């Protein structure tokens, strides 16, 4: 009460402009008491704020603050009966309506947490809203300060600064959890730390729950048995367990009897029991395609371009809608190629035969606008039935082209030329062949494969290119085209969508689909000799997962070459194990499918389980799938086929055991072919939550919907403690139920009591303690638009357009002026194709709907015959209509497909219109609409509008003011979510959500946990909590590199030792263990500090994996509904059913820990346990082993004193690992010779190179954004490729996929492009900048043109070193631009003007000349910011290759132009100096029209060699020496040896040398360092930094001595 | 030397001919003569007797 006084004139200075502040200020002034100052006087910042946002947007606030049910009555509307709730400021007229909410916020943690409660609260309004004959338009307005305009910014903060007092004041002069949340809300801005503490001082109240779990969870657990007791006990189990249960045979290993799995072997794999084929190509349907291409043809102009030329010039004026709907304009350039065509009729004898036939029309077709054929006479049908239907409709689109138009045509006089109906039927009587049949829905000749020459396979891969790339850019097409003509045995096709292919200089092949879209097709190919049609079968596949071969032959026949080359050795074998892999790799290829991958993958496990010496008794019952369709058998013979031919025949064949086993195991990886995608997600979805569901109901726990706010119910929590105990059951001496989660908490107590001691090779001394947008729902991950965005931006959109026609009065909506505003904010009839054409059919389907309920939005906003009973609304139109509420979700399937037509086809009324008025004014948008497809063919849409028109969707209070669990509402800014009162299991506030994903990992599907934001914050206290404390141990390998890379070196030299090294794996690793048993470790640690040597309270971690042991797992929406409409997971929730009947949506557990959560805090556990498991082996079988873990992966090596005699220390092993619940795989394999560890098979003697690893992620991997940067990633692959020693040839042939691929891709060429070709030594020493000079002194092959550019270089470098400064203030000189900084250097250095003129005149083309390669400051800024601040392939190289050849080069004038009109600007310079390399290096004089493109190369040159002088060498300048037989496969290792000429530790000295180079860069964002950092902030194509301030990061290359002998050398 | 098995065939144990630096069998010593004199695990020459 001592501010009482100041606090009436503080905040007289906002004048009440309105009735909203002036009844709330006289009843403040009347009113000088402070027990309803601080809620009556404080509920005015609330109505402060509320203002500000209905203000800014269109609104009405509510001053009345009252129910939307009567709000909506004071109109005349019946009462729909809503739900209730009070809207914060609304906008109505006629019948919509805009809620606004308003909440201000400044942490991000409990911010989101009301935008998605608000959220679903308000999107939980319209399923009765919509039942009233309504729609609504809904907002949020997040605010992260207060930034109001009616006040001034220095008011605001008075009043929190001065009633942070008052409270204190007013409560201490006179509840209690309403109180501290309220001053976390009224803080200031919070830039808060937030730690272990920040637990620490909550409330921590009980429940009388709690007391239960301690009751089973801290009982047994002493943690402090004596040392000498254990001994005494251990003996006792090893003598009870060897005399039990080893001799009556429960082991579950043994002695591998190297005979028996090889018969084993073939009796899995060759189907004996199934009837397929003997021969490979009769069984599979796309090689028997292929099987027909290459052997019906392999045994064996200018009117061709003005085709091309005029038909281009189609494709162009399509995209346009500028002809009302999109049907006319499809006929009239229909109407124009068809006239032009008869025009090239009248002009030679023989066009029509030589040069059609030989192109582009077979026998009655037609090739035009999208892709389509069209074959001649159902044109002229139409065409005929067009002038019918119109008298004279080519004379206003006859020119309608020049008036709202380009009026830029070539159209002579096909515009308006009439067709002769009575001429083109001499062409299309003189052209009739079979027209084109599509198969759906008995003996065999195939000349053996075997017995084919070594010359025509490339025949068959060269083919499987071709066929390949026709599928690939089969998505190239349009999503939206509708045809002209609409509608199983056998089909003869009309039109069809088709693509061309090119074989020989003859003919060509077709291949014809229905669909588009990227979903499965089922084509069919054809050829086209001489003009004869030949059909060859049809197929049925998607496109998508054939990216891989599209240009790589030469590659998929480097590497099948490469491999059997490694079988020198036996040459009879070599020549019949070649062709029968090479009908393998094209199998796979031609099959990618889940199985047929799965099945090899699954043979790693078998070879390591026959060349080492135990395995575990389970494998052979688990390599085996069921083959689904007869075409998994095919591979699924011939690789067995294959093991059973080389592993072991009944001789001694086992002559060099080690290329066997590289050649076999890299047949194991060749597996990896198949891309990654999970061919459906409706089927992967179900897959994940099965293999989630089935470890829980078994040992039975999963619940329904808990309150997600602490309390349980006392029947929900029974089952939790009934697992709990049932947990902690397992008694240590029982040989049943063994494979059962729990763990045997007598056991666990040792296991803690020796680590208390310091006896164990890991110990608890702990140094340096550890005690210091949009924003998804979590019921649908894996889709790119939510359910939240998609009503979000459209709201958005429907207040932005419902304003700006209101500012003036337009009343009328352009088409697209209504979709300029979404295709925006999403991602000038030209510049919405311009980036409408950048989309993904996935966005496409989301696009339509949303253009949808805008359109119908803005006709609800202007608004204020049933008796067609052919088919009836008795049972058919009112019951799917009230099953699925919406007209909008209407699915096709209840009715047959004529009844679209005919419902449809009932005449005008005031339903419908003519004239289709692109005006389009609002208030006719309900009738103008729907007669876009009457007109237009379609009518399906059609039946949904015509549905949707016909209204078819039918004092206490005082103590009460201040703040109580009820008065929460009172305010926006109160913070109702805050963390207050903490909980044994919650933390008062939420309950820790989930979400479900999966992986999309190789063999099987890797679950992924999504989180929400503050489960992301209170995991990292645990996760890096746990990491600090595995950061003292000394075993663990997950995050540091440097003990794994002692572990490597360990097992190298201890498989060459004779040692037994195991190698283990742990099926089900993470659904397995438990929250609580972390909690019953942490309970007995100790953990004491070297700096205050005391046992350390973890109750800030020991209250809080209590939280972890309460998570709230959400299940998918998807398989909400799948589920729903028809399988253990099935039967789970259809016994859910029979109880009260609410949907299954939230599952508390108790044994979880997702993969990736608690992650490193199992990895110690991992480790803790490995070490109790390691030392139990020190003392009961003397031998000394050594255990690491990477929380998933084991190795425990192990010497013997002074041969497989001791399996009896390995399966004790097994059944004290199971009593913790660290279950062992059958996958896993113990012996002498192999041990992996994450992938690195270490054999005795040597490294396993497998190549076939690195080539299959190279051919993938192609991501677009520029075709430097996509020439970047694949040179760091090809980095990696040759770290492991491929050889040359397939690293020099992977770099022309990735060449032609761009060009292919309009780009042209460019002297950078894709790397080198013949490229030998500069992967060891040297970058891509090193690279570069090698490619650019490639063309001057004489070397008598940048030798001069060298002896600059040399005359600048030696002068430019220390000791002499020499013009260091250079920093200038090159900002100039590129033509003129040589010639000032040049000149500086010295010699004539004629050396200038024989230098200046050599010009590349650039085209990231001005800007860069737009398709919707150097590159150096953002990779420093880098250092600073801390879908498949195939759809994403066709946006590569459709936004390449628009609008996409620029100037530095404003605006955009094509490639070719550049690559038309250019003349011919045959004298020499283009005659050098064509189209790559130009002359001068041919630049002379496009001049401002001319950059010179051998700028770049020069700035090449003085980039890498800084970081190598002074033999970047010696002439490069002449190079100087081995067998081809002894490869050994090398070294870098780079001789580097800076000075080390650039982590930090890079950024202080950008004062000194640019000070407005630095202010908004050593000895040799700044000469070079100018020549690489002035263009794009050096890259040097980012290989300073790493290092090279393998150093360790092994090399082929024939790859190492044959290389060059450049001395100094 | 290294570890006491084949270093080609790896599953034999007795009556080994100490080679130039790895260890062999008398089955995979005739496997090799044939083919040539210069081995093909160490690419260096091996005794004859
Ligand atoms: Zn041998
Ligand atoms: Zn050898």
Redesign the interface.
Same mark, same amino acid.
């Given at each position: 009460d001592e501010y009482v006084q100041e606090l009436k004139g503080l905040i007289r200075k906002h004048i009440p402009d309105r009735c909203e502040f002036a009844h709330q200020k006289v009843t403040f002034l009347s009113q000088v008491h402070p027990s309803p100052l601080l809620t009556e006087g404080f509920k005015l910042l609330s109505s402060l704020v509320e203002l500000e946002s209905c203000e800014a947007h269109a609104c009405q606030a509510n001053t009345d603050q009252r129910f939307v049910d009567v709000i909506l009555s004071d109109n005349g509307i019946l009462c729909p009966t809503l739900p209730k709730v009070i809207p914060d400021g609304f906008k109505l007229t006629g019948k919509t309506l805009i809620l606004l909410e308003t909440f201000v916020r400044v942490n991000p943690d409990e911010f989101e947490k009301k935008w998605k409660a608000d959220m679903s609260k308000l999107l939980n309004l319209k399923h009765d809203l919509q039942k009233s004959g309504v729609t609504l338009v809904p907002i949020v307005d997040g605010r992260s300060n207060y930034n109001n305009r009616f006040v001034a910014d220095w008011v605001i903060e008075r009043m929190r600064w001065l009633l942070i007092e008052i409270l204190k004041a007013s409560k201490s002069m006179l509840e209690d959890q309403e109180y501290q949340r309220l001053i976390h809300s009224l803080s200031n801005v919070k830039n808060q730390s937030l730690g272990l503490e920040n637990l620490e001082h909550l409330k921590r109240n009980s429940l009388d729950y709690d007391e239960r779990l301690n009751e089973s969870l801290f009982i047994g657990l002493k943690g402090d048995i004596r040392e000498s007791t254990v001994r005494e006990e251990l003996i006792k189990l090893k003598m009870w367990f060897k005399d039990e249960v080893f001799s009556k045979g429960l082991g579950k290993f043994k002695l591998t009897d190297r005979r028996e799995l090889l018969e084993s072997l073939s009796s899995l794999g060759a189907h004996l029991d199934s009837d397929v084929s003997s021969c490979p190509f009769c069984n599979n349907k796309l090689m028997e395609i292929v099987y027909n291409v290459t052997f019906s043809s392999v045994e064996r102009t200018n009117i061709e371009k003005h085709y091309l030329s005029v038909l281009s010039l189609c494709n162009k004026i399509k995209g346009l809608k500028v002809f009302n709907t999109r049907r006319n304009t499809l006929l009239f350039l229909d109407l124009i190629m068809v006239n032009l065509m008869v025009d090239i009729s009248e002009s030679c004898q023989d066009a029509i035969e030589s040069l059609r036939k030989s192109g582009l029309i077979v026998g009655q077709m037609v090739m035009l606008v999208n892709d389509r054929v069209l074959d001649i006479l159902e044109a002229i049908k139409l065409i005929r039935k067009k002038i019918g239907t119109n008298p004279n409709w080519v004379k206003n689109c006859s020119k309608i082209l020049e008036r709202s138009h380009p009026e830029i045509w070539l159209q002579l006089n096909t515009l308006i030329r009439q067709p002769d109906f009575n001429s083109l039927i001499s062409i299309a009587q003189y052209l009739v062949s079979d027209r084109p049949i599509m198969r759906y829905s008995k003996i065999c000749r195939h000349k053996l494969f075997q017995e084919m020459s070594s010359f025509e396979q490339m025949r068959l891969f060269k083919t499987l290119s071709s066929i390949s790339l026709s599928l690939i850019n089969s998505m190239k097409t349009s999503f939206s085209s509708r045809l002209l003509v609409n509608e199983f045995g056998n089909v003869r096709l009309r039109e069809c969508y088709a693509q061309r292919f090119y074989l020989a200089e003859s003919l060509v092949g077709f291949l014809f689909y229905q669909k588009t879209g990227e979903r499965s097709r089922c084509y069919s190919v054809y050829l086209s000799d001489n003009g004869v049609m030949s059909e060859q079968g049809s197929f049925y596949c998607d496109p998508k997962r054939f990216f891989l071969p599209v240009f790589s032959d030469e590659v998929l026949a480097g590497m099948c070459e490469e491999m059997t080359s490694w079988l020198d050795?036996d040459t009879g074998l070599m020549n019949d194990t070649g062709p029968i892999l090479r009908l393998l790799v094209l199998a796979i290829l031609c099959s990618p499918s889940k199985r047929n991958q799965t099945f090899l993958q699954g043979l790693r496990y078998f070879l390591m389980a026959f060349?080492n010496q135990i395995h575990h008794i389970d494998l052979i019952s688990k390599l085996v799938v069921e083959c689904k369709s007869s075409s998994e058998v095919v591979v699924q013979r011939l690789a067995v086929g294959l093991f059973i031919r080389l592993l072991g025949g009944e001789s001694?064949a &086992? &002559? *060099? *055991?080690?290329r066997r086993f590289k050649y076999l195991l890299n047949v194991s990886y060749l597996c990896h072919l198949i891309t990654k995608e999970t061919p459906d997600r409706l089927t992967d979805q179900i897959k994940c939550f099965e293999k989630f569901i089935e470890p829980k109901v078994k040992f039975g726990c999963a619940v329904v919907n808990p309150s997600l706010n602490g309390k349980l119910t006392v029947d929900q929590e029974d089952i939790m403690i009934n697992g709990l105990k049932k947990f902690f059951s397992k008694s240590l001496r029982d040989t049943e139920d063994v494979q059962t989660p729990g763990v045997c908490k007598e056991l666990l107590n040792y296991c803690v009591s020796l680590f208390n001691r310091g006896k164990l090779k890991v110990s608890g001394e702990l140094k340096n303690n550890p005690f210091r947008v949009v924003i998804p729902k979590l019921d649908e991950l894996g889709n790119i638009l939510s359910t939240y965005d998609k009503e979000k931006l459209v709201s958005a959109c429907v207040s932005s357009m419902a304003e700006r026609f209101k500012t003036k009065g337009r009343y009328n909506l352009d088409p697209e002026s209504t979709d300029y505003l979404i295709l925006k904010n999403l991602t000038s009839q030209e510049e919405l194709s311009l980036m409408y054409e950048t989309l993904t059919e996935e966005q496409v389907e989301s696009f339509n709907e949303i253009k949808y309920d805008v359109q119908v939005a803005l006709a609800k906003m202007a608004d204020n015959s049933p008796f067609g009973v052919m088919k009836e609304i008795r049972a058919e139109v009112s019951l799917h209509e009230v099953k699925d509420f919406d007209p909008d979700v209407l699915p096709s399937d209840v009715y047959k497909e004529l009844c679209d037509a005919v419902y449809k086809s009932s005449e005008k009324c005031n339903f419908f219109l003519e004239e289709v008025l692109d005006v389009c004014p609002l208030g006719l948008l309900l009738k103008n609409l729907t007669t876009s497809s009457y007109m237009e063919e379609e009518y399906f849409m059609c039946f949904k509008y015509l549905l949707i028109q016909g209204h078819f969707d039918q004092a206490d209070k005082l103590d009460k003011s201040y703040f109580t669990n009820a008065a929460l509402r009172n305010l926006c800014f109160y913070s109702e979510d805050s963390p207050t009162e903490f909980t044994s299991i919650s933390s008062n506030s939420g309950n820790l959500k989930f979400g479900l994903s999966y992986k999309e990992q190789v063999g099987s599907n890797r679950e992924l946990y999504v989180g929400d934001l503050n489960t992301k914050l209170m995991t990292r206290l645990v996760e890096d909590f746990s990491e600090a404390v595995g950061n003292s141990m000394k075993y663990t390998c997950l995050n540091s590199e440097k003990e794994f890379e002692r572990a490597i070196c360990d097992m190298k030299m201890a498989?060459? @030792? +004779?040692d037994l090294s195991c190698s283990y794996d742990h099926s089900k690793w993470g659904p397995t263990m438990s929250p609580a048993l972390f909690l019953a470790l942490l309970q007995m640690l100790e953990l004491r500090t070297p700096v205050d040597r005391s046992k350390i309270d973890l109750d800030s971690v020991k209250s809080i994996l209590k939280w972890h042991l309460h998570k709230v797992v959400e299940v998918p929406i998807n398989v909400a509904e799948a589920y729903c409409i028809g399988s253990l997971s099935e039967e789970f929730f259809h016994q859910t059913m029979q109880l009260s009947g609410q949907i299954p949506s939230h599952i508390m557990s108790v044994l979880d820990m997702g993969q990736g959560i608690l992650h490193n805090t199992s990895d110690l556990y991992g480790l803790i346990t490995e070490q109790f498991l390691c030392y139990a082996l020190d003392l009961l079988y003397d031998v000394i082993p050594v255990s690491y873990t990477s929380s998933d992966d084991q190795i425990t090596l192990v010497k013997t004193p002074s041969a497989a005699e001791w399996l009896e220390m390995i399966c004790f092993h097994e059944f004290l690992s199971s009593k913790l619940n660290k279950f062992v795989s059958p996958k896993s394999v113990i012996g002498t /010779?192999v041990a992996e560890f994450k992938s690195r098979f270490f054999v005795? +003697?040597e490294e396993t190179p497998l190549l076939t690893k690195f080539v299959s992620a190279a051919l993938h991997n192609v991501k677009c954004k520029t075709p430097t940067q996509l020439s970047e990633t694949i040179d760091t692959i090809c980095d990696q490729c040759i770290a492991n020693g491929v050889s040359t040839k397939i690293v020099a042939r992977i770099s022309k996929r990735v060449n032609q691929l761009i060009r292919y891709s309009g780009y042209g060429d460019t002297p950078f492009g894709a790397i080198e070709d013949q490229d030998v030594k500069d992967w060891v020493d040297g970058s891509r900048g090193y690279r570069l000079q090698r490619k650019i002194e490639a063309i001057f092959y004489d070397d008598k043109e940048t030798s001069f550019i060298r002896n600059c270089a040399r005359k600048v470098f030696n002068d430019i070193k220390r000791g002499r400064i020499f013009e260091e203030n250079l920093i200038n000189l090159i900002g100039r631009g590129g033509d003129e900084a040589l010639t000032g250097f040049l000149q500086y250095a010295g010699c004539s003007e004629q050396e200038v003129n024989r230098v200046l005149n050599y010009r590349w083309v650039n085209l990231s000349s001005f800007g860069d390669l737009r398709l919707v400051v150097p590159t150096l800024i953002k990779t420093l910011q880098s250092k600073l601040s801390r879908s498949s392939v195939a759809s994403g190289f066709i946006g590569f290759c459709k936004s390449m050849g628009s609008k996409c080069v620029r100037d530095g004038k404003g605006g955009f132009l094509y490639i070719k009109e550049v690559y038309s600007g250019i003349n011919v310079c045959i004298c020499e100096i283009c005659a050098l390399k064509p189209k790559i290096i130009y002359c001068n004089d041919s630049l002379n029209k496009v001049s401002q493109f001319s950059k010179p190369i051998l700028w770049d040159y020069f700035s090449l060699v003085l980039t890498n002088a800084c970081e190598l060498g002074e033999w970047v300048f010696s002439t490069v020496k002449e190079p100087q037989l @081995? @067998?081809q @496969? /002894?490869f050994w290792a090398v070294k870098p040896k780079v001789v580097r000429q800076i000075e080390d530790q650039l982590g930090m000295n890079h950024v202080l040398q950008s004062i000194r180079r640019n000070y407005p860069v630095l202010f908004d964002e050593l000895k040799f360092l700044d000469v070079c950092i100018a020549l690489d902030m002035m263009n794009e194509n050096l890259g040097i930094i980012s290989h300073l301030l790493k290092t090279r990061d393998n150093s360790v290359y092994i090399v082929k001595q024939s790859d190492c002998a044959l290389a060059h050398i450049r001395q100094s | 030397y290294g570890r006491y098995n084949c270093k080609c065939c790896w599953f034999a144990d007795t009556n080994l001919i100490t080679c130039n630096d790895h260890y062999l069998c008398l089955r995979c010593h005739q496997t090799m003569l044939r083919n040539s004199e210069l081995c093909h695990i160490c690419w260096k020459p091996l005794p004859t007797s």
């Open positions: 050795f060349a001694d &086992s &002559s *060099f *055991f080690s498989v060459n @030792n +004779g /010779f005795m +003697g @081995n @067998n @496969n /002894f | -």
